[PDB]
Design an enzyme around this catalytic site. Structure first.
Site, PDB file in Angstrom:
ATOM      1  N   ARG A   4     -61.253 -70.846  35.843  1.00 12.33           N
ATOM      2  CA  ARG A   4     -62.255 -70.624  36.884  1.00 12.33           C
ATOM      3  C   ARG A   4     -62.996 -69.288  36.827  1.00 12.33           C
ATOM      4  NH1 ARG A   4     -59.078 -72.200  42.287  1.00 12.33           N
ATOM      5  NH2 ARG A   4     -57.292 -72.693  40.955  1.00 12.33           N
ATOM      6  N   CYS A  38     -57.704 -75.840  37.839  1.00 10.62           N
ATOM      7  CA  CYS A  38     -58.367 -75.225  36.695  1.00 10.62           C
ATOM      8  C   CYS A  38     -58.019 -73.752  36.512  1.00 10.62           C
ATOM      9  CB  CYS A  38     -59.877 -75.357  36.802  1.00 10.62           C
ATOM     10  SG  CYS A  38     -60.706 -74.765  35.323  1.00 10.62           S
ATOM     11  N   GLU A  45     -53.253 -77.109  25.420  1.00 12.19           N
ATOM     12  CA  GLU A  45     -53.738 -78.437  25.763  1.00 12.19           C
ATOM     13  C   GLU A  45     -53.535 -79.363  24.574  1.00 12.19           C
ATOM     14  OE1 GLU A  45     -57.516 -78.936  28.125  1.00 12.19           O
ATOM     15  OE2 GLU A  45     -57.655 -76.751  28.031  1.00 12.19           O
TER      16      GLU A  45
HETATM   17  C1  HEC Z   1     -67.532 -78.252  35.980  1.00 14.10           C
HETATM   18  C2  HEC Z   1     -66.043 -78.043  36.236  1.00 14.10           C
HETATM   19  C3  HEC Z   1     -65.085 -77.347  35.259  1.00 14.10           C
HETATM   20  C4  HEC Z   1     -65.365 -76.453  34.262  1.00 14.10           C
HETATM   21  C5  HEC Z   1     -66.744 -75.888  33.830  1.00 14.10           C
HETATM   22  C6  HEC Z   1     -64.077 -76.117  33.657  1.00 14.10           C
HETATM   23  N1  HEC Z   1     -63.018 -76.802  34.246  1.00 14.10           N
HETATM   24 FE1  HEC Z   1     -61.089 -76.681  33.744  1.00 14.10          FE
HETATM   25  N2  HEC Z   1     -60.775 -78.135  35.084  1.00 14.10           N
HETATM   26  C7  HEC Z   1     -61.638 -78.741  36.018  1.00 14.10           C
HETATM   27  C8  HEC Z   1     -60.958 -79.710  36.859  1.00 14.10           C
HETATM   28  C9  HEC Z   1     -61.548 -80.566  37.985  1.00 14.10           C
HETATM   29  C10 HEC Z   1     -59.670 -79.717  36.400  1.00 14.10           C
HETATM   30  C11 HEC Z   1     -58.498 -80.578  36.884  1.00 14.10           C
HETATM   31  C12 HEC Z   1     -58.436 -81.754  35.897  1.00 14.10           C
HETATM   32  C13 HEC Z   1     -57.481 -82.878  36.255  1.00 14.10           C
HETATM   33  O1  HEC Z   1     -56.807 -82.807  37.302  1.00 14.10           O
HETATM   34  O2  HEC Z   1     -57.411 -83.850  35.466  1.00 14.10           O
HETATM   35  C14 HEC Z   1     -59.571 -78.752  35.308  1.00 14.10           C
HETATM   36  C15 HEC Z   1     -58.411 -78.494  34.559  1.00 14.10           C
HETATM   37  C16 HEC Z   1     -58.247 -77.586  33.502  1.00 14.10           C
HETATM   38  C17 HEC Z   1     -57.009 -77.400  32.716  1.00 14.10           C
HETATM   39  C18 HEC Z   1     -55.674 -78.172  32.880  1.00 14.10           C
HETATM   40  C19 HEC Z   1     -55.850 -79.713  32.765  1.00 14.10           C
HETATM   41  C20 HEC Z   1     -54.828 -80.484  31.938  1.00 14.10           C
HETATM   42  O3  HEC Z   1     -55.003 -81.705  31.797  1.00 14.10           O
HETATM   43  O4  HEC Z   1     -53.854 -79.901  31.436  1.00 14.10           O
HETATM   44  C21 HEC Z   1     -57.269 -76.421  31.803  1.00 14.10           C
HETATM   45  C22 HEC Z   1     -56.304 -75.856  30.744  1.00 14.10           C
HETATM   46  C23 HEC Z   1     -58.643 -76.027  32.016  1.00 14.10           C
HETATM   47  N3  HEC Z   1     -59.236 -76.749  33.048  1.00 14.10           N
HETATM   48  C24 HEC Z   1     -59.307 -75.066  31.286  1.00 14.10           C
HETATM   49  C25 HEC Z   1     -60.656 -74.731  31.453  1.00 14.10           C
HETATM   50  C26 HEC Z   1     -61.336 -73.834  30.582  1.00 14.10           C
HETATM   51  C27 HEC Z   1     -60.676 -72.968  29.483  1.00 14.10           C
HETATM   52  C28 HEC Z   1     -62.645 -73.920  30.916  1.00 14.10           C
HETATM   53  C29 HEC Z   1     -63.843 -73.183  30.291  1.00 14.10           C
HETATM   54  C30 HEC Z   1     -64.138 -71.751  30.719  1.00 14.10           C
HETATM   55  C31 HEC Z   1     -62.750 -74.860  32.001  1.00 14.10           C
HETATM   56  N4  HEC Z   1     -61.511 -75.353  32.346  1.00 14.10           N
HETATM   57  C32 HEC Z   1     -63.952 -75.211  32.606  1.00 14.10           C
HETATM   58  C33 HEC Z   1     -62.989 -78.458  36.090  1.00 14.10           C
HETATM   59  C34 HEC Z   1     -63.638 -77.568  35.236  1.00 14.10           C
END
Ligand code: HEC
Ligand code: HEC
Ligand SMILES: C[C@@H](O)[C@@H](O)C1CNc2nc(N)[nH]c(=O)c2N1
Ligand SMILES: C[C@@H](O)[C@@H](O)C1CNc2nc(N)[nH]c(=O)c2N1
Ligand SMILES: [Zn+2]
Lengths: 421, 421
Positions: free
Chosen positions: B121, B118, B295
């Site tokens: 974060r 992510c 995305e």
């Molecule tokens: C409660 C957990 C959580 C939150 C809140 C979260 N993420 Fe993530 N994010 C993840 C996880 C787990 C992955 C890995 C996903 C996967 O491997 O399919 C990810 C992956 C991503 C990816 C790449 C995934 C792809 O398919 O290309 C992006 C871009 C991203 N997050 C952006 C953000 C943004 C912008 C926010 C908002 C501030 C956000 N995330 C909030 C858990 C979170």
């Protein structure tokens, strides 16, 4: 057994078994993956001040011979046998061996083919090998380099070549080129701190100055070769200007691009790597292929730690360089990479784009698995620095690992070099 | 004992010591790196037909309690210690334990914090926790989900939130969402062999049709929610239309972009992931954040295995789409994305560009090292799908390791589900 890897874009799959013959030198462990370290000791082959113990060399020598003869379409048992026997005897009395011509030619190509971070590997079987293993002086080294440079530039129609210098003996008589590339620009430290030219070559440019090279304080000054024969102190030689072909940057649409006054050499030659083959080490083996737009237009020109020109090119295009949200950087980089690709073709110099490049890699990779059930590849290095997922490699799962022959990194010479004078 | 990593773009360096506390579940070894396999077993936590043994659970339970309590400004000696006794007796008499409201919140924000892939974060502090562990039916799940979708969309001002359904018990009464996202368009296998809609979803779209859903064979048809409550067979629930905020695509300069008739939903919400905390596994924890331009613009629209709209828009711009070397694909992708980021801003909906996202991650990454002296990061996922070398994370060395809490992958439900009817 074997690990399966998929391609989420094509749906194609491969079963990699070749990886079992890898060398346990990587640093990743079930606890953490360190695949994103740029210059790892794991991929570096350091200096020795004592020969490679004959005993240790023997297993490796046999391994290579086997591989050499294991490569033929139609086996040649007698020769194969005779060679294993013949080489065992040479290392016994001599304490090292020599590669036959065909063997050196085979080793240099397989080593290339075994280069995980190279995307141009489709050419791995077309390589010009200059045998300079009998070389003995700095001046010779220079003349060999000039010969290599002339052959490869080929008047713009660039060709892949490699010149192999004497192999390492006791590690104290190393023949090495100090520059990272045979052709590269100087980097000057100005009195106010600011850098002039290529900031990536400051250390090396200063060494040339301290060694007597006259600084010109230009933006695109071709650094001299800092050669080292028989472990002696390095001496300076300047490649003849007519041998160094360059290309002037111009945009097919933007009349103002030429005012930026950029250019770049046409020949990309790695000069400081170490070739390892059957336990032997050739710290002297400069090689080359041809350029891929991205290397110049994205990395050389747009990296912040380099010519860092995005700013100005954004100004010229009149894009809203105040807010990232507008994607001015992405638009600029494109126009800049179109200039390089156009300029090079306009001056009739061989170059390749990341698209065509990524595309040929796939055909190559498919053959590698169809032949030896393996193709060592480092995703982080193969996927282009722009339009990453637009290229099929970004969707290719791959396994990275070290084999033999192999091109290793070396520790900067000026860091480990004890000055005789 | 630590690992130095650096940023070649700024020269900044960190020392990682947190990777030592990681789980030895990765597949990388000294002989080969598999960092590029997309959905590895290492990052997956599949099903089971028996409860987690107490002898293996207790350790993990305690380790989490220590960790949770060790996160306070000022230690709570008594509370911390008393909490450990409670969990032990609880696990000792029921063979499992229940987290508290504050521990659950801590766990989720912490899990997010340890998600190597992510890039957003920096926002881990701001998360909404919807406690639905007392849930007991598919309709109840549906309600919780709609509650989440409404709180999160917040009329364009997206808010990150997570909903946690019952923890796993014996492994035969799993509460999970079969879809990969609370909102996602259908994939229709047409008769001519072509695909209508999002080809990435042909399998679930069919399972839906097999379950009484009526296909509208549209290009952006929101799929129904396949909900598995208490291990029972799944059941469909349609998210109330217009409880699904969407964005129509328009390019600020190309007035023909509208004619492409493209749109996308505004809420990115992962649904099919498992949250592991203190040995407890929560197979149903849909959560969301807000979209990062690429995305949608790079992947969703241009991946050939997705909407693959790269060529059609290329012809609209007049670009010579028959010569890769003209970088027409690169021209397209940029405008498509310019469009995507423009539309969202126009309808006032939270969107973030890849440049600004990278800029913030670097900030988070420094904080994480200063603070916990670690930051598990997967380079291969953090570098954006377009314009890599332009962002700072591209020249950032990092370590990828699995900590706890953690968001794992699961095996697609339909492959392992034992149907009753
Ligand atoms: C409660 C957990 C959580 C939150 C809140 C979260 N993420 Fe993530 N994010 C993840 C996880 C787990 C992955 C890995 C996903 C996967 O491997 O399919 C990810 C992956 C991503 C990816 C790449 C995934 C792809 O398919 O290309 C992006 C871009 C991203 N997050 C952006 C953000 C943004 C912008 C926010 C908002 C501030 C956000 N995330 C909030 C858990 C979170
Ligand atoms: C046929 C033309 C050709 C093309 C195009 C090609 N190569 Fe490579 N190439 C390498 C090695 C070794 C690396 C890894 C360089 C490093 O780690 O610094 C590499 C790296 C590269 C890179 C990435 C470099 C970077 O710094 O980002 C590109 C692009 C590339 N090669 C293109 C050995 C070779 C050899 C050696 C016999 C030949 C010939 C060769 N390469 C021929 C070619
Ligand atoms: C972050 C770090 O690993 C980085 O400097 C990278 C990643 N991938 C690369 N890939 C190529 N081809 N060339 C490079 O110089 C790099 N550098
Ligand atoms: C591993 C590789 O083959 C590939 O499918 C990738 C690389 N990087 C990624 N990065 C993100 N954010 N999301 C992805 O799905 C991928 N997939
Ligand atoms: Zn690894």
């Amino acid at each position: 057994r074997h690990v399966r890897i998929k391609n989420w874009g094509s749906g194609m799959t491969f079963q990699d078994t070749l990886h079992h013959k890898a060398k346990g030198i990587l640093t990743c462990r079930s606890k953490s993956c360190l695949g994103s370290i740029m210059t790892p000791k794991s991929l570096t082959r350091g200096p020795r001040d004592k020969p490679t113990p004959p005993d240790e060399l023997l297993p490796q020598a046999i391994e290579f011979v086997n591989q050499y003869y294991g490569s033929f379409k139609e086996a040649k048992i007698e020769e194969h046998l005779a060679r294993v026997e013949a080489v065992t005897k040479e290392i016994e009395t001599t304490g090292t061996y020599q590669l036959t011509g065909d063997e050196l030619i085979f080793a240099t190509k397989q080593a290339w083919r075994n280069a995980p971070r190279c995307i141009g590997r489709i050419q791995w079987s077309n390589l010009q090998v200059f045998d300079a293993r009998s070389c003995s002086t700095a001046r010779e080294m220079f003349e060999h380099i000039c010969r290599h440079v002339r052959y490869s530039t080929n008047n713009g129609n660039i060709r892949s070549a490699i010149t192999v210098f004497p192999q390492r003996s006791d590690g104290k008589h190393d023949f090495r080129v100090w520059n990272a590339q045979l052709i590269r620009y100087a980097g000057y430290q100005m009195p106010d701190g600011s850098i002039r030219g290529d900031p990536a070559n400051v250390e090396i440019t200063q060494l040339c100055i301290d060694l007597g090279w006259k600084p010109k304080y230009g933006r695109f000054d071709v650094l001299p070769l800092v050669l080292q024969a028989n472990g002696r102190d390095p001496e300076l030689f300047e490649i003849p200007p007519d041998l160094v072909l360059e290309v002037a940057m111009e945009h097919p649409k933007y009349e103002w691009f030429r005012e930026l006054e950029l250019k770049w050499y046409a020949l990309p030659a790695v000069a400081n790597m170490l070739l390892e083959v059957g336990g032997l080490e050739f710290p002297g083996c400069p090689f080359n292929g041809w350029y891929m737009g991205t290397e110049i237009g994205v990395r050389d020109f747009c990296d912040v730690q380099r010519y860092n020109i995005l700013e100005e090119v954004g100004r010229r295009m009149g894009l809203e360089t105040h807010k990232l949200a507008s994607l001015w950087k992405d638009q600029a980089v494109v126009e800049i990479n179109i200039a390089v690709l156009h300029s090079f073709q306009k001056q009739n110099v061989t170059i390749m784009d990341h698209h065509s490049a990524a595309e040929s890699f796939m055909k190559y990779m498919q053959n590698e698995y169809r032949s030896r059930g393996g193709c060592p590849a480092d995703w982080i290095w193969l996927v282009p620095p722009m339009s990453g997922s637009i290229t099929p490699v970004f969707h290719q799962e791959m396994l990275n690992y070290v084999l033999s022959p192999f091109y290793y990194y070396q520790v900067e010479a000026w860091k480990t070099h004890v000055w005789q004078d």
